[PDB]
Amino acid sequence: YEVTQPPSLSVSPGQTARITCSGEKLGDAYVCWYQQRPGQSPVVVIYQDNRRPSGIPERFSGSSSGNTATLTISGTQTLDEADYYCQVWDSNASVVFGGGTKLTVLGQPKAAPSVTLFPPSSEELQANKATLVCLISDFYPGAVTVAWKADSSPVKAGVETTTPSKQSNNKYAASSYLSLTPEQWKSHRSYSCQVTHEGSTVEKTVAPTECS
Amino acid sequence: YEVTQPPSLSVSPGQTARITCSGEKLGDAYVCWYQQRPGQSPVVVIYQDNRRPSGIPERFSGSSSGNTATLTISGTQTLDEADYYCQVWDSNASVVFGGGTKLTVLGQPKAAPSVTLFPPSSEELQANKATLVCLISDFYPGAVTVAWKADSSPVKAGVETTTPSKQSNNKYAASSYLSLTPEQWKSHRSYSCQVTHEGSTVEKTVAPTECS
Numbered sequence: 001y002e003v004t005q006p007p008s009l010s011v012s013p014g015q016t017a018r019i020t021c022s023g024e025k026l027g028d029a030y031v032c033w034y035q036q037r038p039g040q041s042p043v044v045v046i047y048q049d050n051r052r053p054s055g056i057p058e059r060f061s062g063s064s065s066g067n068t069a070t071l072t073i074s075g076t077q078t079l080d081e082a083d084y085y086c087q088v089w090d091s092n093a094s095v096v097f098g099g100g101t102k103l104t105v106l107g108q109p110k111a112a113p114s115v116t117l118f119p120p121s122s123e124e125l126q127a128n129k130a131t132l133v134c135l136i137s138d139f140y141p142g143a144v145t146v147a148w149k150a151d152s153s154p155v156k157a158g159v160e161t162t163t164p165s166k167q168s169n170n171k172y173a174a175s176s177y178l179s180l181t182p183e184q185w186k187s188h189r190s191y192s193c194q195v196t197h198e199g200s201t202v203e204k205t206v207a208p209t210e211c212s
Numbered sequence: 213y214e215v216t217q218p219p220s221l222s223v224s225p226g227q228t229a230r231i232t233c234s235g236e237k238l239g240d241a242y243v244c245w246y247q248q249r250p251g252q253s254p255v256v257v258i259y260q261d262n263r264r265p266s267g268i269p270e271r272f273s274g275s276s277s278g279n280t281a282t283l284t285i286s287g288t289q290t291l292d293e294a295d296y297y298c299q300v301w302d303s304n305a306s307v308v309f310g311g312g313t314k315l316t317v318l319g320q321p322k323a324a325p326s327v328t329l330f331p332p333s334s335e336e337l338q339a340n341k342a343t344l345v346c347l348i349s350d351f352y353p354g355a356v357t358v359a360w361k362a363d364s365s366p367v368k369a370g371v372e373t374t375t376p377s378k379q380s381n382n383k384y385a386a387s388s389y390l391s392l393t394p395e396q397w398k399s400h401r402s403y404s405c406q407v408t409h410e411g412s413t414v415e416k417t418v419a420p421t422e423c424s
Contacts (some may be wrong), residue, residue: 002253034254039375041297041309042246042254054305085253093266097253118330118345121418131328133347135389137372160349160385165375173374175387177347204335211334211423 003088005098011076012106019071021086021098029088031069033062036083036100038166046071078105078170111171113139115195117204120185130185132206134176134193139164142172145196149203151188213237215300217310219355220410222322229285231313233298236279243281244299245274254297258283290317316353322410323383325351329405329416332397342397344418346388346405351376354384359406359415362396 003023011017021031033046044053046062049069061072069086084103088096113136120130136144142164148155158179164172176193185191185208192205215235223229233243245258256265258274261281271286281298298310326349332342348356354376360367370391376384388405397403398420406415 041311043309044299044307053307055307087254087256093264095256095265097255099253116333116336116341116343116345118333118336121328121330123416123418124328129328131347133328133330133345133387135343135345135387137389160379162374162377162385162387165377167372173372173387173389175345175347175374175385177349177385206333206335209334211421 001096003086003096003098005086005101007100008102008104010104010106013075013077015076017071017073017076017103019084019086019101019103021069021088022067023088024067025090026064026067026069026088029090031062031064032087032089033060033071034085034087036085038081038083042085076103076105078108081105081170105170108140108170110198111138111140112200113137113144113195113197113202115193115202115204117191117193117206119191119206119208119210120182125182125185128182130180130182132178132180132191132193134195134204136162136164136172136174136176136195137167138169138171138173139197140171141198142166143198144172144174146174146176147194148176148178149192149194149205151190155191213302213308215298215308215310217298218313218410219311219357219408220314220316220353221296222316222318222353222410223288224318225290226288229283229288229292229296229315231283231285231296231298231315233281233283233300233310234279235281235300235308235310237302238276238279238281238300240303241281242301243274243276244301245272245283246297246299247294248297249294256299285315288315288317293317311357312355314353314355320352320382323350323352324412325349325356325407325409325414327405327407327414327416329403329418331403331418331421332394337394340394342392342394344390344392344397344403344405346407346416347385348387348407349379349385350381350383351386351409352383353410354378355410356386357408358386358388359404359408360388360390361404361406362400363402364404
């Protein structure tokens with residue numbers, strides 16, 4: 001049982017967003033707004049129709065009419081990209097939620113991924129295990145393509161890749177792991193990791209010359 | 213104040229959940245329990261701490277022994293699977309919110325985390341870079357807590373943990389990283405990664421390397 005909400009609303013920094021909740025009787029309910037970074041513990045931004053819990057900055061304001069509530073951020077930012085929900089609290093212990101609203105901020109600079117390739121750390125070799133890890137950090141948009149290579153040959157099998165996740169700066173991350181026997185490691189002259197954002201490609205590699 | 217909510221809770225078709233919120237000052241707090249079924253409008257199941265809102269059954273019950281706000285659920289069905297968030301109203305003006313407890317009725321064995329900890333590569337260092345990477349794979353259900361320390365002190369600085377991803381063998385994977393400068397690495401006799409799953413905490417460790 002949901003109050004009604006607009007699923008998406010795209011803006012740009014400095015602009016202002018007005019997310020609203022409508023429905024009959026919306027009038028007898030103290031109202032609240034919850035935020036949820038892509039994936040994360042919701043944050044209370046506003047309660048009792050008009051108030052902001054301590055800690056929240058003064059850019060998020062709330063209000064209502066009869067049949068409706070409204071969420072207004074003055075100076076929407078990127079780190080405001082979130083999931084916005086309204087909780088409807090009617091007298092009789094009854095409470096409802098609008099099926100969220102996604103606020104995607106426009107104009108975020110495309111970002112090239114910092115590709116990083118790591119060979120198996122001693123302990124693992126000392127454990128008779130070997131793992132290579134390829135950290136695809138800081139990209140944007142949330143989309144990457146990985147491909148492992150072993151000294152010219154492609155490494156089909158042994159590969160696992162994180163579906164991109166959203167860091168704290170609106171930049172994504174993913175990883176790749178390739179597993180092998182210290183029999184597989186110290187054999188090839190090298191092992192590479194190819195990562196294609198969109199336009200550019202990057203290939204970093206490692207060689208069993210793993211210092212001490 | 214920190215609210216310390218567990219990662220996952222794998223019940224069998226029937227046992228009673230025992231989700232608890234253990235924050236530092238749970239006195240001066242009216243805990244509310246939020247349930248969110250696979251990307252949907254959340255639902256409150258408990259308020260004030262024990263007071264249930266309306267239309268909700270009493271299979272639900274929540275409580276507050278000193279620093280422990282606990283959430284009880286009877287006759288667990290599939291229908292119950294969700295992420296349980298504990299809202300802690302900290303009296304005066306402020307709120308905190310536990311991080312979740314991916315309640316999963318079993319449907320596959322529980323698998324604890326494979327956690328390998330990688331220090332910076334030889335190359336990464338010539339470039340004048342230095343990144344710690346904590347790979348956590350093969351776990352199930354999909355939920356961690358990753359912690360870092362340096363000479364045993366905690367580090368809330370650039371730790372950038374991912375989001376559990378279903379690896380190709382129906383287990384999940386995730387990663388965590390810390391970005392520090394070469395000199396910092398070399399200045400710390402030791403760095404730790406700590407992944408707290410469901411019941412079993414793990415913490416592998418690496419120390420500086422030299423060769424030359």
